[PDB]
Structure 1
């Protein structure tokens, strides 16, 4: 009597993830005339008006 056996197994797993985000903003103002307190109030870069 002769008995023989063979077994084999393999597992492969690869994972990849990429994330890229970009955002910019720019502002240019050019005001001529009446450089008093009110135009400094209007010189507020965040609010548009």
Structure 2
């Protein structure tokens, strides 16, 4: 009697994920006219109102 069994197995799997996001915001003011404390308080760089 002759009997011989052959079995071969192989597995492969790769998963990849990448995400990138950016957001930039700027605000510039320009005031000319006023010397009293009113323009000094208005010269606050920190809300455009």
Task: Note the C-alpha offset of 1:42.
Answer: 3.0
Where does structure 2 lack aligned partners over 5 or more consecutive residues? none
Distance 2:38 2:46 in 1: 16
Normalized against structure 1, the TM-score is what?
A: 0.75
Structure 1's consecutive aligned runs of 4 or more residues displaced over 2 angstroms after TM superposition are: 35-46
Distance 1:30 1:17 in 2: 45
When the two chains are superposed, the root-mean-square deviation of aligned CA atoms in Å is: 1.6
Q: How many residues align?
A: 49
